[PDB]
Write a protein that binds this ligand. Structure first.
Ligand SMILES: *[C@@H]1O[C@H](CO)[C@@H](O)[C@H](O)[C@H]1NC(C)=O
Ligand SMILES: *[C@@H]1O[C@H](CO)[C@@H](O)[C@H](O)[C@H]1NC(C)=O
Ligand SMILES: *[C@@H]1O[C@H](CO)[C@@H](O)[C@H](O)[C@H]1NC(C)=O
Ligand SMILES: *[C@@H]1O[C@H](CO)[C@@H](O)[C@H](O)[C@H]1NC(C)=O
Ligand SMILES: CC(=O)SCC[N+](C)(C)C
Ligand SMILES: CC(=O)SCC[N+](C)(C)C
Ligand SMILES: [Cl-]
Ligand SMILES: [Cl-]
Ligand SMILES: [Cl-]
Ligand SMILES: [Cl-]
Ligand SMILES: [Cl-]
Ligand SMILES: [Cl-]
Ligand SMILES: [Cl-]
Ligand SMILES: [Cl-]
Ligand SMILES: [Cl-]
Ligand SMILES: [Cl-]
Ligand SMILES: [Cl-]
Ligand SMILES: [Cl-]
Ligand SMILES: [Cl-]
Ligand SMILES: [Cl-]
Lengths: 532, 532
């Protein structure tokens, strides 16, 4: 049976799924680790004990315990990202979409979901890999990993809650793929990992961590980089937040042992109810439990690893969206609302700047303000709004990514950079938000090819062009079709620094993405803050 | 006799001079102070003892002892500013151009020459007031004052060389005008003082100093402000330079008395030969002997006087030229030459920045560089050149002036601001230098009306329009002709901050002159340098 596969962990039975007037195989909910429940909470993941009989992989698995966005009840724009299955700590499973007939040794792509390390699900409609697997004929895998305190609580020095376990969950799934994907017709030697925001930062982290490098061939990072200011904390900061979390749950704080024991006796939702209370500052685009620079998963500081070339050298494809910051301003910055144009007063602009650069002294805040203020029209509510939007995106996603791309390219084997600036015609979010964080994903997964979703024909063409870039890159390490007719996406070099726009218009090439602002964030501001 | 005038100092005999197919009276070289020679060198000026008989005021007087520009021997562009008479310490005289027939009580305008306080002459061809006196029918006076060590050596606490004497020379001439101008048909109650660069800074200094306020009605400042970074030094810095000057002349430095005695025994040229050796830093647009904030001529700091409104409240008309810095970059910045386009390398740009902001630490220099660098095209030699040009002009003239105008306007009785950006068609200096420092003067004095000078007809029209703005302002405190047909030069207000362009095109109104860059120089950079 085409739907029956025998793996080293045991046999699994898939299900036939329809896709674009055709069909393919799907193996949903395959376990790759033992349930991290009970006393295994906060601990590293243990490999799934092989099973007897046949595992039913016909339906999606539970989602990991996580905070749920209720900011706009019933609104599809926000709820499309929420868990669409039952939540449980028993959530370590993976999904596989296999072309029909089953391949013998084709390209593999593993998706790592984003969500600021505090949320995320592999089962979202926007992550359904059947379209991509079918259209580009690749084996598409989507993994899962613990988020929130469950996956990143960090009490360095301890073995019950070392930190980064959520990252180890990812690695274990990659290990499972490396060991069993052949049985599904996948080529374990041509695996490409890709993800967005926290997932993109994750991809970069596996590129850096020695213990992950051998498990994949190349990588794609979307709107996320390992060096982002929100993607990691020091061991001391991680410890402070863990203790503070315990303080919120009236725990005994005399020892790690006692703290960990107390937290383990709490129900999942109890940890989630107070998770946001441990942030050090009033801020936006900052999440409580994220990876920790432990000296283990990460040997040394991210920057020193990047400077010395201490990382996997291969090919990478990465990029950003035009308005990465709008979402986080809506949810927390004063003056922004979902149903208004959100024109920002000068006062609110100032408040926003402070929320955006929490680690800044007055001089730093002044530098940022001056850098993003048009002094010939400083009371222009639209410029203030758009200016704040740029500040958040530049600081949190674009400039950190540009720093990563420039450092990696010095030792890498090929870089491809993109700038996604197409706002979908069927977007339910307001116009002022522009090309939102995470809204290139629907194009990467081919949702536009689905007529009932109501995208324009041009948007379907873009989706197909993007899916082919991604799949072709995953297969050859070059997004371009050898001996092709269409325009060529040029390599990004240290000298030329070329990139392309990804939109419904004919491809255009540019150079030095957001260079003026990124010199500010990556060189000047840091010097200023350090000197003061 | 129309050429014979009897003043409180004695009788003077003028000369009839031709001007634009007509004639007027001229009284050249009238003394207003005793010769500051011998033991009077460095001392405050003493009023000229009245004389018996008739003083021959038919020819120009000697020029004060000063450094002479020999950077381009035979070049008119530079030599037109050099002394055109014999130099002597006996140089305290004034010149008067009186309409014919002699008026009874008309508007008076007193010109104060510029030249960085280290040079200048009232007898330059470009300062001939016959055209302005004739065309606008005003009594035009041009004074003189000691420059260099002779007029500004400052050993605060001493009475032999207190400092600011060159400014006192100016005041004495203003006093003389206040007492005797009536005899020449001038109205001592409607005197307007005006000057360019150091002369413009001087005008502002008389507006501030209590001892000068009662001697004039209103003021005009061209490309200069009292608060310019080069226009003054502290008493301690003034003292350091005086001592260092003495050290250069192998003087006894045991006491002010001995230092002053030694300097007085030196020949004029001996002081001038080493004058530039006392500057504290390698720099451009910085002059050795300038006014000193002594607590006497200036009661308190310039900034505190401006904030509290401790200054003469009247009407003022002021402005700047488009490329104030080009001249000083040519003479000292590496990479600039008179006969080349002076395209600047990135290295030379960096060196220039350092020469331009001598009081800056590395962080400050980085701030300036970032502020004026186009990172999408940082090796563009023309942008680098023009960028440096802006840095020098913004820092040394424009932003300081904008700071002054905004502070004065809060307490003043009417402000008129202009931006002069017309490059003369017969300019002998290279094109890259643009609208040079001091090149609006020829238009203020009506040289374009002289056919043999070869200006375009449009340039003659501009000159006449500027001369009428200046003269009309001097007369009424408003440059605009009451019930006029031409466009109106609007008042500059704290809120609107309107100004006009002065060029051969039809008047245009703008707002917030160089606001973006001046917020940098006037608010941000100072904070940065103070915090670091
Ligand atoms: C699980 O597998 C069975 C076949 O053994 C199938 O009938 C069922 O639909 C699958 N999922 C469930 C329990 O609904
Ligand atoms: C990638 O590496 C191969 C050798 O392994 C080399 O020949 C090729 O030029 C490299 N390409 C890039 C873009 O560095
Ligand atoms: C000085 O005045 C006399 C008349 O007494 C005149 O002849 C002469 O030209 C004037 N200047 C000189 C000395 O040339
Ligand atoms: C100038 O002062 C007079 C009173 O002395 C006042 O009436 C007039 O409005 C003032 N004008 C300006 C521009 O301040
Ligand atoms: C980007 C986000 O979803 S903000 C997190 C929710 N919070 C504001 C209630 C803490
Ligand atoms: C602006 C200037 O004339 S520079 C002064 C002359 N120096 C360079 C020889 C000291
Ligand atoms: Cl077998
Ligand atoms: Cl086996
Ligand atoms: Cl479908
Ligand atoms: Cl708090
Ligand atoms: Cl960069
Ligand atoms: Cl949507
Ligand atoms: Cl909408
Ligand atoms: Cl008489
Ligand atoms: Cl008398
Ligand atoms: Cl003439
Ligand atoms: Cl030196
Ligand atoms: Cl200003
Ligand atoms: Cl000239
Ligand atoms: Cl020329």
């Amino acid at each position: 049976s085409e739907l029956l596969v025998n793996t080293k962990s045991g046999k699994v039975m898939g299900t036939r799924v329809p896709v674009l007037s055709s069909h393919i195989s799907a193996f949903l909910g395959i376990p790759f680790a033992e349930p991290p429940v009970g006393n295994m909470r906060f601990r590293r993941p243990e490999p799934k004990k092989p099973w007897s009989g046949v595992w039913n992989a016909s339906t999606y698995p539970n989602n990991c315990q996580q905070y749920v966005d209720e900011q706009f009840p019933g609104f599809s724009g926000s709820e499309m990202w929420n868990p669409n299955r039952e939540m449980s700590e028993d959530c370590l499973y993976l999904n596989i979409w296999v072309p029909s007939p089953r391949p013998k040794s084709t390209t593999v792509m593993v998706w790592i979901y984003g969500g600021g390390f505090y949320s995320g699900s592999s089962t979202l409609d926007v992550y359904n890999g059947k379209y991509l697997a079918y259209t580009e004929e690749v084996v598409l895998v989507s993994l899962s990993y613990r988020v929130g305190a469950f996956g990143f609580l960090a009490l360095h020095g301890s073995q019950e809650a070392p930190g980064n376990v959520g990252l180890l969950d990812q690695r274990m799934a990659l290990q499972w793929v490396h060991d069993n994907i052949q049985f599904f017709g996948g080529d374990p030697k041509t695996v490409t990992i890709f993800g967005e925001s926290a997932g993109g930062a994750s991809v970069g982290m596996h590129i850096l961590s020695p213990g992950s490098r051998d498990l994949f061939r190349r990588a794609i990072l979307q709107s996320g980089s390992p060096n982002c200011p929100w993607a990691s904390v020091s061991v001391a900061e991680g410890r402070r937040r863990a203790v503070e979390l315990g303080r919120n749950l009236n725990c005994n704080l005399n020892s790690d042992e006692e703290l960990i024991h107390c937290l383990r006796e709490k129900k999942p939702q109890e940890l989630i109810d107070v998770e946001w209370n441990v942030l050090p500052f009033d801020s936006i685009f900052r999440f409580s439990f994220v990876p920790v620079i432990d000296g283990e998963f990460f040997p040394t500081s991210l920057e020193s690893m990047l400077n010395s070339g201490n990382f996997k050298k291969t090919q990478i494809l990465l990029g950003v969206n035009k308005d990465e910051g709008s979402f986080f301003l809506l949810y927390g910055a004063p003056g922004f609302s979902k149903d208004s144009e959100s024109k920002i007063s000068r006062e609110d602009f100032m408040s926003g700047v402070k929320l955006s650069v929490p680690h800044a002294n007055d001089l730093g805040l002044d530098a940022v303000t001056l850098q993003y203020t048009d002094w010939m029209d400083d009371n222009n509510g639209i410029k203030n709004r758009d200016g704040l939007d740029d500040i958040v995106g530049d600081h949190n996603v674009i400039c950190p990514l540009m720093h990563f791309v420039n450092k990696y390219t010095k030792f890498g084997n090929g870089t491809y950079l993109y700038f996604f600036n197409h706002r979908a015609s069927n977007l339910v979010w307001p116009e002022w938000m522009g090309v939102i964080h995470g809204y290139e994903i629907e194009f990467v997964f081919g949702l536009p090819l689905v007529k009932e979703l109501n995208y324009t024909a041009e948007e379907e063409a873009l989706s197909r062009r993007i899916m082919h870039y991604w799949a072709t890159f995953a297969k050859t390490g070059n997004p371009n079709e050898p001996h092709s007719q269409e325009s060529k996406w040029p390599l990004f070099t240290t000298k030329e620094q070329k990139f392309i726009d990804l939109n419904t218009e004919p491809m255009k090439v540019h150079q030095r993405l957001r260079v003026q602002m990124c010199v500010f964030w990556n060189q000047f501001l840091p010097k200023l803050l350090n000197a003061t």
